[PDB]
Design a protein around this nucleic acid. Sequence first.
RNA 1: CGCAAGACGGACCAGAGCGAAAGCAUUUGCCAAGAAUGUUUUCAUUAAUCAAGAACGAAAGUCGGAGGUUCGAAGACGAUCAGAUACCGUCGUAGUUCCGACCAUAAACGAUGCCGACCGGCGAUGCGGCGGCGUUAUUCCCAUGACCCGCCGGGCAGCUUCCGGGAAACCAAAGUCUUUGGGUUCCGGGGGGAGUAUGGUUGCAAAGCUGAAACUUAAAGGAAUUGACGGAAGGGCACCACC
Lengths: 98, 62, 83, 25, 213, 136
Amino acid sequence: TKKRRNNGRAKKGRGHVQPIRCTNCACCVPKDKAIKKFVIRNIVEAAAVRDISEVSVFDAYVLPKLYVKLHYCVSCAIHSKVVRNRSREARKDRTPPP
Amino acid sequence: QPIKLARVTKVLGRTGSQGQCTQVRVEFMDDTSRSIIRNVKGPVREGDVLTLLESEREARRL
Amino acid sequence: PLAKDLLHPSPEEEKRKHKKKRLVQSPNSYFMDVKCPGCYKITTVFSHAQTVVLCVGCSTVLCQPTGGKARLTEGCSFRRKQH
Amino acid sequence: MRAKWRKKRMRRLKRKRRKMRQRSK
Amino acid sequence: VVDPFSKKDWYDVKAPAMFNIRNIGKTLVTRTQGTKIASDGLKGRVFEVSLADLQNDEVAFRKFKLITEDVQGKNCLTNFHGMDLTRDKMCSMVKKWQTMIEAHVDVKTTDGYLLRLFCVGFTKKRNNQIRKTSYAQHQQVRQIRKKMMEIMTREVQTNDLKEVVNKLIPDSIGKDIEKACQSIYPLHDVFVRKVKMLKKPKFELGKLMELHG
Amino acid sequence: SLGPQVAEGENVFGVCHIFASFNDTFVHVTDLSGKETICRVTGGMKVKADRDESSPYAAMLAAQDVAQRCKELGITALHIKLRATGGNRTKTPGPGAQSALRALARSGMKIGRIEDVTPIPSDSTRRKGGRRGRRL
RNA sequence: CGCAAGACGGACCAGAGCGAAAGCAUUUGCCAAGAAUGUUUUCAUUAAUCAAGAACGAAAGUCGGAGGUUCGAAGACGAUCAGAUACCGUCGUAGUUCCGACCAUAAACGAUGCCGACCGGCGAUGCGGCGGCGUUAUUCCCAUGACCCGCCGGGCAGCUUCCGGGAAACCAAAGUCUUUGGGUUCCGGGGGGAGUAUGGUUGCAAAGCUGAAACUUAAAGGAAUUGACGGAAGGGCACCACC
């Protein structure tokens, strides 16, 4: 039976969207189909930044961040627990929780 | 290095694999404004002083 | 609702509809008298001009058209025909 | 049996059935 | 069996005198044993040194690329080769719900130092803009792009290799690109993001000694 | 092994290369240009167990050993250039990035400006794997 | 540090568009369309769907030319294994690439023919045109963008609802259907046998379209519900668990 209204993806008037590869595997999953994450993160997290301010020669130099747009295939997204199975009404919530 | 003696002001919860380590807010006896979050073994109550070995380490918050 | 006046609705409702979908099919266009600084006489210009209008004796250039309603030059003032 | 690999086994054998009709030409 | 660090000439590196901050950082050269010379083993170095170790005191996301070209002795006269932006800055800027516009102009300076300038510009979600999108049309982006090109053509032909690098550290190309493209789509996060060297001419020693004094 | 600068208030800059791949870790301190090198030590040169080459311990020994070797010449400060696996492969640094960078932050080997030198394809060629990829 | 190679066109990039579908994402140019729109210009039923008949049609495959950097059927080897001409790794042939022809098939799916009418609501958006305060933009005031309130036309989807339907899941279309007729094309008739046999036909071949029957069988199936189960996700309880 038709589980989702959109066919597990987000094209509705295309027919073909070029696939961007998986990151955990290398599965050829389509662009809209892929679970996409964009990481905005410090190059040293919280414990190392305590120290490196003393080794920084410059007057309170704020770190560069590290920018990774991840492309997950659906077998990889649920392996790493990025996404997750939801109840029949909870499925349709497109609201990303902070 | 200094060997510091940080007083427990709040117990923030219970952590560990088998649930034994106590996530604790320890206030330094030196400075009563500067504090860290520190994981502690053994039965800890509100109003005792640990013997820290260095304060470079700082326990993670959940 | 149930009882809507498709017989006798308001002008504020009829004029907020498509030119083809009103009580009676009547257009959204008009004729306006574009007067110029070159000569003094009057040319009756269609609103959605989609063409050029030229003055007498190469005095001035009146209109330069766009998609729907036409522009007029800073000076080319229009005086609208009612009939 | 997968409906794809049933279809492939029917094909390999159609290539064979044709070869046992080709020898009489 | 023996230490190959017996033969390292730590020559001090010069930034050109047309900038305030002099010091760069010291670089070993394998000493002149046999044939290969200290001038020979220094004239293939390209130095990644950022903005705030060349110009007095400004922003901290921009960098520059200087070569070695003249070896007098203990003063490495650096000539301008390239410019590249920090990719912490690059990746942070290019977010969703905007139109990134690149334009590359292969254009020749007065003296024969042919560069390749890379413009970059992003659409601003306006002050009272409620619409989530903030996209342009195609014939808005080409009009921006053709004028984005047209200003980088201006700040190469008009002036020398000197008064274009007093336009690489300021916004003295990118601001007129930001200003003169306000009338198409108001773009805000607008730089020129890279310079690349292609055709280095015959080295003039008489030229560079004014740039280093 | 002879630096000409006063030890009072002068700081000589260098560059480092923390190549944190997912099966190895390279700490590589070179000259400013990078065209001539000073010292380089890997996860394998320190530790003789193949599975934990990229580990944050075999990465800790890398920056400790260079700051043991680098101090014999007299480079004060290091510019950071963090490389990933790079190319069509994953752009994340390995488990030996935030340990090796932390390990020469325990030496006090002074820190210049920091950037990613991850060799990212602008528009990538085909990746090694397949249509269906790495099946497990 | 440069040199050569030819692939590919990130993030921007969307439940965004365009194209008959297939498909189409590097900037500058050129050739020829195309909808949507606006129109107090024309023509005056010229139309809708359509056996025969045709154009295009992912990929793989074939044939001849050029190029083979990445990739990877077949093949080789290392493990894992009882065994894996398997999953994993290392190479690697055709292939992947371009030109010239063939091929005419895909879960070519929206598993939903096409033109027309009618029947709820709303927030969005895309394009065009209109109307409506101000803000900034070239200030040198306007023409006008970038926003902004709405309106209208058509498209892409959305959200809600006892419109109504339906076996249900669901769907403003799958609705207006025992209160059964707006038009028109294709097509289904229990499961297998079987897209098989055969003839006909196209193809260089692989194969395509057309396409049975004998015999066989009491089910095959659709949707949903409860349980059991999972080498599914998450939340608990216990010194017959652990610390």
